């Protein structure tokens, strides 16, 4: 996994690759790592897949409760607190490494959140096995107050760096762009890897597989 | 990490480096390790990032509620006590080396160390974190009784610059804060602003 986030002039750009592994085998080629938290907050997930899925879902759900009650748009600091306090409670046994980004009444905010419950509030972050590749791109090229298309280029370049240099990362690049006026959930943003074209025909004709037993059970 | 705090007549100076590490990767180069617990009480954090953040958030809550109940600014010794209680009780489950420093109207400028294990001791000045090993000598030779605020800031930036030079686990920018009756003054020494001392190349 490579996930990443950037604060630009008018918002956040989040990014992620789409590979999921079981050991050193790819289980899923097009898995979605950018999670809905609220309409104005998203969260990229790296680490134990079930933990990132169940952790983001639970917090999103509690924020919907929260915002249902307050009648207000939720804040990024609230998502950050809820996540970090839960992760801290579980002492690192919930293996969720998160890039939390959104826009609220106090502007754009971006946090990285670690399995043990520490968080860092920063203008660019990366997480996952490809995070040093992605971070190298950010240190080389990030400037403050980038325009939207610059920020999107930079994030997709950072994910690509992870995709190609980390055996843990692969397949597509997904982005999410969040501003005061807009949410663009771009899945896929880029498809830099394509399965090679199938050269031979293996046309297995009917009867090729021998059958011992058959039962037809009709339905209505 | 290197952290430091110094008492002067009327206030305190606090300082930290800005490095967060996992193994020898730098997860944050510009970390802010000087966290506000109240209007005029800060803690400097070393050790586990998760632990010191969680503990600092909990003490902030405890102290804020205490302070509304009493309807008075909190004592620095009370902030230190709350840190001590939590760090001592959970010493087997926490990795946290804390300096609490600030100002209150009763005792003025104060610095308290709560090192790992959760003892508490008041000091003229305190240092902590991995990098502090490399500056015991320096601060022992340099510290003078009666330093002004500006002298305490200079002393602090020097000491941290030296530790940061030698400790792989410290580095980045120096963050300073001065706390007195009049409020909190924060600043960053970065790049060429960080005190410089020659590598001792050969004649």
């Amino acid at each position: 996994t490579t996930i990443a986030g950037v604060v630009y002039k008018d918002g956040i750009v989040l990014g992620a690759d789409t590979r999921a592994t079981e050991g050193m085998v790819v289980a899923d080629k097009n898995c979605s790592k950018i999670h809905f938290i609220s309409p104005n907050i998203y969260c990229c997930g790296a680490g134990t897949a079930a933990d990132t899925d169940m952790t983001t879902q639970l917090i999103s759900s509690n924020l919907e409760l929260h915002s249902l009650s307050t009648g207000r748009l939720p804040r990024v600091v609230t998502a950050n607190r809820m996540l970090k306090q839960m992760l801290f409670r579980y002492q690192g046994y919930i293996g969720a490494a998160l890039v939390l980004g959104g826009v609220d009444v106090t502007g754009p905010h971006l946090y990285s959140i670690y399995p043990h419950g520490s968080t860092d509030k920063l203008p660019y972050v990366t997480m996952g096995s490809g995070s040093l590749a992605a971070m190298a791109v950010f240190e080389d090229k990030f400037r403050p107050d980038m325009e939207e298309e610059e920020a999107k280029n930079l994030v997709s370049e950072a994910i690509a760096a992870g995709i190609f240099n980390d055996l843990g990362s692969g397949s597509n690049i997904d982005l999410c762009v969040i501003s005061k006026n807009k949410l663009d959930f771009l899945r896929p943003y880029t498809v830099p890897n394509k399965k090679g074209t199938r050269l031979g025909r293996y046309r297995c004709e009917k009867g090729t597989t021998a059958v011992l037993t058959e039962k037809i059970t009709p339905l209505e | 990490t290197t952290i430091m705090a110094v008492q002067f007549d009327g206030g305190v100076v606090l300082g930290a480096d800005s490095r967060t590490t996992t193994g020898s990767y730098i997860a944050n180069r510009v970390t802010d390790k000087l966290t506000p617990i109240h209007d005029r009480i800060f803690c400097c954090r070393s050790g586990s990032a998760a632990d010191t953040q969680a503990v600092a958030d909990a003490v902030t809550y405890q102290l804020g509620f205490h302070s509304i109940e009493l309807n008075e600014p909190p004592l620095v010794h009370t902030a230190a006590s709350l840190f001590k209680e939590m760090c001592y009780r959970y010493r087997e489950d926490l990795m946290a080396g804390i300096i609490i420093a600030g100002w209150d109207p009763q005792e003025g400028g104060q610095v308290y160390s709560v090192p790992m294990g959760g003892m508490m001791v008041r000091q003229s000045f305190a240092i902590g974190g991995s990098g502090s090993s490399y500056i015991y000598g320096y601060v022992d030779a340099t510290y003078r009784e009666g330093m002004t605020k500006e002298e305490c800031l200079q002393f602090t930036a020097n000491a941290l610059a030296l530790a940061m030079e030698r400790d792989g686990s410290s580095g980045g920018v120096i963050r300073l804060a001065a706390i007195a009756e009049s409020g909190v003054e924060r600043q960053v020494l970065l790049g060429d602003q960080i005190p410089k001392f020659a590598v001792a190349t050969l004649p």
Binding site: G92, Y114, H116, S118 | T1, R19, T20, T21, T22, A27, T31, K33, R45, S46, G47, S48, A49, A50, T52, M95, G129, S169
Partner: peptide, 4 residues
């Protein structure tokens, strides 16, 4: 883990 992650330290200061």
């Amino acid at each position: 883990i992650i330290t200061x």
